[PDB]
From a paper:
Interestingly, we obtained an unbound [name] crystal form, called here PeDPP11altconf, which lacks electron density for helix α14, indicating its susceptibility to unfold. Similar to [name] complexes, this structure is also closed (rotation angle of 27° of helical domain relative to the catalytic domain), illustrating the enzyme flexibility. The helical domain displays a high diversity of structural states across all solved structures in this work.
Numbering used by the authors:
A (entry chain A), B (entry chain A): 21 to 164, 169 to 314, 346 to 717
């Protein structure tokens, strides 16, 4: 209901409501176009996550998943940071992360008229370039002489009725500072996933580095900690039910302007196929041995705008709705095939991201120095392919067999990827085809890969079954996109017309746009809920809950001996709740989605109160229409984070830098 | 902690505490030795259950399980009362139940000195007759000229330190008045068993009949409704958290005076074997395809009495404790074999209660009229054997195989029942032995039994495999009892000595005796609890909870169309809670156990507020030491009972008789 993800510019038209909920911040304290504000502290981590700066030395807080790749890359047999955690006791002990990028919003500019004028310049348009962030960002040099360490991001808002430009400081020297052990960072990661109550210490600590002047730069020996314009201060006094909660971050995608028919499609195609493919997964895992509906809500909002379009002489609103419905039915087959490919293969079967040999392998194999460069690319691709964070569940060969068999049944042979339809044809079934791949591929195992990398050959790399699988699957993805574009372009144009009417009716200052992975703020209150009859969920969880879930045999519920020793002695310090319990997590009515992972949660005074890392609902259903009655965002208590650093890790250096207030 | 099951005579020494909890009743209103009180309204149903009289025409309320046998006996294909429920719209439509007995306490008398003097009369005693209720009840005619329709019950209290006599009016014309459908009477009977929250309408309605003068009698055409001295009035104003709750009934067995070593034995033998055998059951069901410990608490109480025995010159207390421990270890093997036979075969394998041919079958088969009499006994035994209420779960042949196989592994051949050790020896395994029985037995199926009963033969009945099984299993039971008696008698004597010391220390007026299936009262408050971190259970459940658990495919969760129609229209009447929700169940901190099934739950003013039908904990662990912090008794809301009669059934006759106050 009230889950708006507001633009930073809309702080003025929201500040009144927020102060009545208990906020003591001023509008300029949250966003200031002429000074420092909380904007300069909320960063984009690795492009898909969110982080917060908490010191004058550029200390960065985020989730455990967002920094997983970095923790994994730095992990070994002797020093398993992924399992045991990592704690640097000095600036020099902080681990360098090649490739890792963190962006800070320097300033935001309205370029609506500029972008629109640039779109008219196109001779014969595809019809989707007015929404493509890649195309829109290329129009930036003509608008702004582009400095280094700066990126100019331009994206569509309100379905293409507005265009805002984001000037980004791009830091390319982001180093790993700290990380909790896996038993804490993802306690009950499988069972309690997308679920409240929760008892997970989901965090990881990084730091921004720059030159002597504080400007973004590549890794250098001489680089020093970045000193931000503004960092969020950490509060350790605690939280209470009913408290105001401010969340800033980069929400990925929402669908708040969905026509009733768009909800039907999402339910019948997008959502059903997601649940169907996910069901096969937990079936493969299972062969272990020892009052108002969504469509009704969006239909009411649809009719509300249509009744406003009528009564006023506007016909376009009503033309847009039917134009949308027309495109929906037209792409029914295309959308269905895209979703099965996306839910069944691209996600679910890791083989889709198998390494591909570059031109240096096929060509120039005889050039020794160039050969090793191509082999290095292969090795690099394999490490970023083999075992990701949360996604490896069970036996990969059996999982791929079950998913591909279902895919082959849902999609006819002539509409399958070439590798799949040819493989099934030659080996008989989708099972036998997968079996062959895991039988012959280099990348089927680490020991297989390393055994091959000790005497490589060009042929073998070029004709690898798993590589051909990933390429042909990707090729189909892009064939579908080009073909469904004949329906998506009329859909997009009609959507722009429909949102334009909603904009005319409700006014832009009072209408939050859909999330598009740009900086936004949202607010609510710390509050529990009633999941079912007789049962009430509180807003806060404690360390006692961790001990209740302790199962020495269930690896997701393993409790570290040190953590258990702290619980027995009640050695919590000033981090504990007033009632003497040690806080772990809390939930809030604030709307967050994919991309808000690692978002700072702040006080009524704008002090860091926790880190967002999950929500109690899964699927995108809550992004179509938020339901604050039961839908919550699950947040790591910042006192628990401090507790892990202090009483568990013994890394006093980080406490002294953070300086938690009380 | 405070789960005393007080004698009716102890009402004086408890009334003060109860009134401070909010009770407005006087002591004489609960128990009066010279007048009518709530005592005369709380009846013993079928010997093992409890019932309450709620009208001047002898209307009786109890659970759905307590009257199951009656509902089943009266059920047929055309009129399935077990599934669809039963509702009599007049006195003449009430169904006669042969054999059903209901006892009312006429008066209670202290006969301690009399019984003890009678025990000294025994020449050479076994050592257990001072606890045997059968023996003690035979001493009654010498104490009291015994009228008809009266039974004199004498039992041991405080381990044989007190003896109280109960004069019982025995009604043998108890007729079935009403019963809810199975979908209501046992909604979620499997999953929500021994569990809170709960949404079960567990009840059944009977009525006492008597002669023209109101005296107990066998069934007769001329019998009229019994008019009790005192009946409990039904209150429909509702309940609130914190309200005083009085429960009267007949609790079966508790073990509050257990020595620390007695707790160890119970845990290692009694409880472990119960859980072990129960585990095999849910394993057979699973091959469906598509801060202080108990011993520590009782040790503290043990030492508390021992420290009191010392300091005072008493040595017997300390002699008793070691005497108990001596008997415990002595019967270790005997107790273990008794428990495996009890948990593995007597309960779990229904074959243990297979029909046995009487002397009229073996002898006098040539006498035609006597032959049919024996066949009638066989038929009677089969109906009371074949499919009980809550116990038939799944395939019986596979269940017996799994349990007997485990039994055979735990108990060596020479210590097994003769039928089992000889069957296993001839057929090879416990599986093949069970297979033979279900292959050849008459009683293996209803259709098998009826097919046999159309042309019976003497041999076949006499040598039936299932009959021989039940007899030899029973024979072993009685061989074990006679043999373990050499340890149980010194144990009993030592227990009597130990409780005697506790009696001397705490005083009888302030000490509640262990339950022995006699009339007792207990009290507490209506109150929820915290099962785990972040989760809170309320004290009351609503009809909304039923609809949330609705699963048309899960038979235990089938919701009747009529009940669902009532929920949609909110047709609750004055039965609904103040907030507009329809109450179903509530829980209280009152200690109840097996035998309290159907016990009346009453107001602070002694008005019927609900019926007890379960508790949120299983096993006997709470009967050794009650833990009111989380242990609750689960109670049917009386307003829900009235609602089922009125708005669901349409049996207005019962409402007009009950006359619910407000
Ligand atoms: Ca607090
Ligand atoms: Ca009420
Ligand atoms: Cl293509
Ligand atoms: Cl705690
Ligand atoms: Cl015997
Ligand atoms: Cl309700």
């Amino acid at each position: 209901m009230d889950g708006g993800m507001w633009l930073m510019q809309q702080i003025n038209g929201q500040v009144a409501r927020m102060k009545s909920l208990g906020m003591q911040l001023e509008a300029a304290d949250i966003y200031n176009p002429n000074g420092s504000s909380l904007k300069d502290a909320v960063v984009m981590f690795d492009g898909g996550c969110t982080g917060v700066l908490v010191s004058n030395q550029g200390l960065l807080l985020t989730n455990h998943h967002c920094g997983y790749d970095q923790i994994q890359k730095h992990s070994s047999v002797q020093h398993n940071y992924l399992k045991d955690g990592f704690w640097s006791y000095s600036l020099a002990e902080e681990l360098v992360n090649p490739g890792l990028e963190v962006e800070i919003v320097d300033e935001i500019t309205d370029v609506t008229a500029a972008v629109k004028k640039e779109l008219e310049r196109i001779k014969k348009p595809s019809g989707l370039e007015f929404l493509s962030p890649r195309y829109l960002s290329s129009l930036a040099p003509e608008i702004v002489a582009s400095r280094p360490g700066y990126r100019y991001e331009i994206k569509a808002f309100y379905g293409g009725n507005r265009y805002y430009m984001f000037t980004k400081k791009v830091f390319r020297d982001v180093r790993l500072v700290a990380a909790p052990p896996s038993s804490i960072g993802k306690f009950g990661s499988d069972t309690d996933n997308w679920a409240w109550p929760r008892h997970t210490g989901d965090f990881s600590i990084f730091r921004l580095y720059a030159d002597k002047n504080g400007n973004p730069a590549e890794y250098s020996k001489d680089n020093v900690p970045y000193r931000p314009k503004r960092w969020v201060k950490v509060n350790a006094q605690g939280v209470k039910e009913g408290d105001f909660a401010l969340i800033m971050g980069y929400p990925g995608t929402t669908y708040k302007f969905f026509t009733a028919d768009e909800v039907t499609e999402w339910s019948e195609i997008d959502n059903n196929i997601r649940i169907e493919m996910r069901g096969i997964l937990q079936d493969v895992m299972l062969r272990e041995m020892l009052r108002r509906s969504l469509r009704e809500i969006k239909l009411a909002q649809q009719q509300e705008v249509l009744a406003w379009a009528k009564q006023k002489g506007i016909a376009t609103t009503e033309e847009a709705v039917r134009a949308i419905s027309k495109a929906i039915e037209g792409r029914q087959d295309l959308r269905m095939r895209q979703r099965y490919l996306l839910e069944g293969i691209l996600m679910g079967i890791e083989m889709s991201n198998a390494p591909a040999a570059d031109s240096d392998i096929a060509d120039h194999w005889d050039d020794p120095a160039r050969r090793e460069a191509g082999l290095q690319s292969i090795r690099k691709q394999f490490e970023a392919f083999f075992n990701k964070d949360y996604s490896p569940e069970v036996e990969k060969d059996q999982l791929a067999i079950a998913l591909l068999t279902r895919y082959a049944e849902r999609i006819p042979a002539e509409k399958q990827p070439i590798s799949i339809r040819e493989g099934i044809a030659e080996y008989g079934s989708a099972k036998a085809y997968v079996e062959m791949i895991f039988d012959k591929s280099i990348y089927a195992s680490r020991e297989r890969f390393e055994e091959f990398m000790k005497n490589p050959d060009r042929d073998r790399l070029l004709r690898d079954p798993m590589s051909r699988f990933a390429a042909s699957v990707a090729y189909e993805h892009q064939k579908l996109a080009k073909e469904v574009a004949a329906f998506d372009a009329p859909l997009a144009a009609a959507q722009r017309s429909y949102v334009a009417s909603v904009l005319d009716m409700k006014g832009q200052p009072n209408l939050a746009p859909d999330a598009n992975l740009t900086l936004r703020f949202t607010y609510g209150e710390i509050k529990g809920y009633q999941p079912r009859d007789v049962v009430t969920y509180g807003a806060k969880s404690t360390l006692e809950g961790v001990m209740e879930k302790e199962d020495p045999n269930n690896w997701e519920y393993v409790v570290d001996p040190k953590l258990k020793a702290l619980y027995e002695a009640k050695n919590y310090g000033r981090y504990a709740n007033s009632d003497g319990s040690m806080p772990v997590n809390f939930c809030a009515t604030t709307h967050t989605t994919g991309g808000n992972a690692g978002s700072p949660v702040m006080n009524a005074r704008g002090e860091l109160i926790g880190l967002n890392f999950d929500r109690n609902w899964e699927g995108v259903g809550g992004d179509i229409e938020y339901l604050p009655n039961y839908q919550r965002s699950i947040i790591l208590d910042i006192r628990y984070l401090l507790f892990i650093i202090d009483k568990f890790a013994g890394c006093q250096r980080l406490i002294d830098e953070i300086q938690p207030q009380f």
